[PDB]
Design a protein around this ligand. Structure first.
Ligand SMILES: C[C@@H](O)CP(=O)(O)O
Ligand SMILES: C[C@@H](O)CP(=O)(O)O
Ligand SMILES: C[C@@H](O)CP(=O)(O)O
Ligand SMILES: [Mn+2]
Ligand SMILES: [Mn+2]
Ligand SMILES: [Mn+2]
Lengths: 187, 187, 187, 180
């Protein structure tokens, strides 16, 4: 019908440009919200103010925290198996996620496939990563300096930090011994 | 009424959560963009992905630079008078502004007030500031340590740096002798 | 006593100030380093360049990563007991830490307190936090909206995100104490 | 070698440690690079130990500089007198800010001498005269324009560029502010 943005927030954006609401042609408002014909109209104002569109929605989505915190339950959220050409590779389970840090992706992974399983590196991630081995023994492989493959074995209680965009893979060291890790991507 | 989100961007957000476009119920798309019925539909997806609405437009604004640069012309952009409690204080003129740094607000100001008029401090602001005097003699007043008023006179070629949230005011030292400054707010 | 600063780095700093090494009094150098008589001499140059002393060492710490990565082993690093007002609260064990992200503090904690002991909240901290329960049942208490105490129980596989500066405490839900958590502080 | 106690305690707290010499306000390191060892042990870079410990050069939230009051020099690039560089206010509260006033001395009769670009963003404003600006654009192609009094330009990091007089013999002036 109409696209709403928070008045106070929009007024602060205008103030960084030394403007007020009067400097916007023909928008309507009420006590708390400013109304736009649609995204296209909003884009035009954004262009005029030389602010990117994203800024106009910052802080508009309601926090999903309760009292400064958010709780998630085992087996409670998103989960799926990862199966590639008939080979069961991972179980991916979301741990707590929040709209107060969309850059945080915390996972619990079951590692299902073995030694006769082929290498399938990722392309690396913009996020930093720390991984901790909750159970079993885990083969970690990654692409090091001068694009050379490296490897090591992480046992229960070991951990690893991985810089952005380093390509890497986690598999069971033994096979038939299913291992588990927690992987936290951030920043 | 329809809302467009960049497909590649949205696909990257979904991939960090180990999802694909198939995991979104009733969206349509084309080669480059994903379409939502309206804000209400978008808010649902945001909820489902536990991301704020702003994230869907992050990075997606087209640069307003041409070849790494952007040029602005005297009197070419926004301008207005600033009147504070009945006293004509400034003329604000925008210098170059760019969506590649929405936090940069560079201004040319004419000064209109003086000692015959009452002081009208601002409340300070988040941005750092450097000011340079292009013409005339400028009385600067600000709130210092222990909330005490301070003052000095800046002549042509002098400059001043102001820490965030220090309240301040620039007026003509002589009065009827109209002065000019450049103010650059950043960060 | 003979303080060394990286030459290339110092040259870049000088270049931002439109200076060269010739504009520094009384420093000697070699191919890779610039030498100062002492802190007193360095503090003078810092004053002259209007930079803080810290800047002279920014980026100059050698990375502790090997090939983009760093590995730590269970029981391989720092640990200590935490006793708060006479109550044995935690065992803190460092997981991997790196000088490439000093804001990342990943810990494994043993929990030693319960309800038969008094509450000992921390003061909160600047870092975001995600915690995951590896073993047992964990009472989590925190200070919520309007400074009211809140509580919940986290079981094995549950996780929790805590916003910066929210004061909080983790104890065993069941008296007779040994639950375990992984706590990752970041950003 | 002295470090602020409060600051060091906060650093130790991020590693779940405490002071495991000092006085009320400061902590002392004997080896002078005894400090590098502790930094290594905490896996914090050395620089962090001095953050916030240089005394502010502001007076009451502000810092004032005067024309001709600070650093100044001539810039001669290939036997060609190119700029006069004059520092405007500089502060240790933002070591990333370099604000300059430049007199321009070269023109089209003299060869082009681009810089290599730099890490800072830049905004420039023309206080006097007419200024020829040349820069390296997309696909490493040269571009040019003329900026008159009151015009301004924003330059992305690492774009190589040059400012000269458009007319020549007609000496122009700019203010250049580098930040972030
Ligand atoms: C010129 C500028 O510093 C005054 P204000 O716009 O912040 O009040
Ligand atoms: C486990 C962690 O949240 C406790 P602390 O950081 O308050 O010591
Ligand atoms: C005005 C200034 O940008 C010229 P350069 O000193 O960076 O080459
Ligand atoms: Mn201001
Ligand atoms: Mn904590
Ligand atoms: Mn420059």
């Amino acid at each position: 019908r109409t696209l709403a943005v928070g008045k106070a927030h929009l007024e602060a954006l205008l103030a960084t440009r030394k403007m007020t609401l009067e400097h916007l042609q023909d928008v309507r408002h009420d006590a708390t919200q400013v109304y736009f014909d649609g995204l296209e109209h909003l884009q035009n104002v954004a262009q005029y103010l030389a602010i990117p569109l994203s800024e106009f929605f910052v802080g508009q989505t309601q926090s999903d925290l309760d009292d400064g915190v958010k709780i998630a339950r085992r087996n409670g959220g998103f989960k799926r198996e990862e199966i590639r050409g008939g080979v069961h590779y991972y179980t991916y389970e979301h741990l707590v996620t929040t709209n107060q840090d969309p850059g945080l992706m915390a996972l619990r992974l079951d590692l299902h496939s073995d030694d006769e399983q082929p290498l399938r590196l990722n392309g690396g991630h913009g996020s930093r990563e720390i991984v901790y081995v909750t159970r079993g023994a885990v083969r970690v492989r990654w692409v090091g300096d001068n694009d050379e493959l490296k490897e090591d074995v992480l046992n229960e209680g070991d951990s690893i930090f991985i810089l952005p965009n380093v390509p890497h893979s986690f598999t069971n060291h033994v096979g038939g011994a299913k291992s588990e890790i927690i992987a936290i991507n951030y920043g």
